Amino acid sequence: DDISTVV
Amino acid sequence: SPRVVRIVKSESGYGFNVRGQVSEGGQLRSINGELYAPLQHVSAVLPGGAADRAGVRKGDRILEVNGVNVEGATHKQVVDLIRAGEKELILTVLSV
To answer: Residues in domain PDZ (chain B)?
Structure first.
């Protein structure tokens, strides 16, 4: 699965 | 077509989320009818934040970060590039 980061 | 956006960090950050694959490389996929290796993309934009004000939109695919090509890049590589500057970020994006 793809992953996410808040930047 | 690809476009360049400059974003200056608020103390809350750039105001967007980046989403995509953990690994390097992978199957090609066309974006707006043009062929690319896998691209990370913008999965959220904070209303009124720096990215929003700069014209970044949900779904934008990220082709370059700070002048470095990130076609096929790992998520870590893209995040590390986003973090390269103290306060400025330049992206090449493709809106979908």
So the answer is: 4-96
